[PDB]
Amino acid sequence: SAPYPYKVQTTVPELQYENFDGAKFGYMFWPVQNGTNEVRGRVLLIHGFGEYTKIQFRLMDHLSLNGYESFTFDQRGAGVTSPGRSKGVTDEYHVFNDLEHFVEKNLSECKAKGIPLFMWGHSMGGGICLNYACQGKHKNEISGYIGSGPLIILHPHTMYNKPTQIIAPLLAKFSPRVRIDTGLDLKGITSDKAYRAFLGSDPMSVPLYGSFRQIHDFMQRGAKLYKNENNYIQKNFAKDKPVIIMHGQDDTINDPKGSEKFIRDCPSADKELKLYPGARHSIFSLETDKVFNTVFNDMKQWLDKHTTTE
C-alpha cells in the first residue's frame, strides 16, 4: 500500500487499552520529548469520523517537540476500539459519557503535575469539542478549547454530492442500526496527493462504516450549534474560556460558515477564528507541510499564550 508520508521525529507511544462501559478503548499517551523535560500542558485530542490514532501522529509529534503532552483515544464506533460489528455503532449518550471518562482520567494525571488540560477536536471531534464546552461536566476545568474545521454545518458541495448524508439522519429514528459507507472524499479532505494516496490505501481507513444513529447524532450535534435556538451558546458556554477555531478556507466538507457564526455567537472574551487560504479539510493531519506548519504554529503560539507564567 501507500506509505504514511510523515516521518515521526519522537518515540511513538505504546498503543494501550482500557475497558469502560462495555468497550475496549485503544488509547495513547504521547509524552513531551524535547530534551528539556518539562511540560507546559496536555492536549486531549478528539478525532473525527473515520479517523484514529495514527491520523493524529503528525500533531502529537509536533506537540511533543514543543513541550506539550497529548492524549487521544479511538472513540466508540471507531478505530481499534470498535472493529467489525461495532464499527460505527455509537450514539449521543456514549459519545459524551466515554468522553467524560477520559477527561477525568487526564484531569487526574494532570492534577499531580499541576499542568493545564486543553481540548482539541477535528470535524466530528470539533463538533464534540465545542459542545463539551457548553455541556461538559468539567467544562469549567478545561483550560482551553481548540476546533479544527468543526462539524457544525456541511458544505453545499458535500450535501449536493453525498445526499445520503442527508437521508441517513432523516431515517435514523426508524432505522438506527443500518450501517453505511459513503466513501472518502480524498480531494475534499486534503490538497496533498501524498497523504491522499496513503489515506485511500490505508486498511484502517477503508472501509468506513457509520450507523444511522451515529450519523444523525453528530449531524444534529452541529446543527444545534448553528441554529443556536434561544441563545444556547451564550447561556451555556463555559464563562470566559479561551476558544480558537482553525478552518481551511477551501474546506468543501465542513462549511466555514459554521465556524464564522459560532465565534460570533460565543460569549467568551477570549475567542478567535482563523481561516487558512489554500487549505482544505484535514489541516492538522493530512494537509501539505506548508499548510500544517502555518496551522500548527498558530496553535502552538496560542497554547503558549495560555500557559505563559514566568
Swiss-Prot record:
> Which terms in the Gene Ontology molecular function aspect does this entry carry?
monoacylglycerol lipase activity; serine hydrolase activity
Pfam families named in the record: Hydrolase_4
Q: Kindly list the biological process annotations in GO that this record carries.
A: triglyceride catabolic process; triglyceride metabolic process
Keyword Lipid metabolism among UniProt keywords: no
User: Where is it found, in Gene Ontology cellular component terms?
Assistant: cell periphery; cytoplasm; endoplasmic reticulum; lipid droplet; membrane; mitochondrial outer membrane; mitochondrion; plasma membrane
Q: Which reaction does it catalyse?
A: Hydrolyzes glycerol monoesters of long-chain fatty acids; a fatty acid ethyl ester + H2O = ethanol + a fatty acid + H(+); 1-(9Z-octadecenoyl)-glycerol + H2O = glycerol + (9Z)-octadecenoate + H(+); 2-(9Z-octadecenoyl)-glycerol + H2O = glycerol + (9Z)-octadecenoate + H(+)
Q: Which UniProt keywords apply?
A: Cytoplasm, Endoplasmic reticulum, Hydrolase, Lipid droplet, Membrane, Mitochondrion, Mitochondrion outer membrane
Additional note from the record: Present with 2140 molecules/cell in log phase SD medium.
What's the protein called, per UniProt?
Answer: Monoglyceride lipase
Source organism per UniProt: Saccharomyces cerevisiae (strain ATCC 204508 / S288c) (Baker's yeast)
What gene name is given for the protein in this entry? YJU3
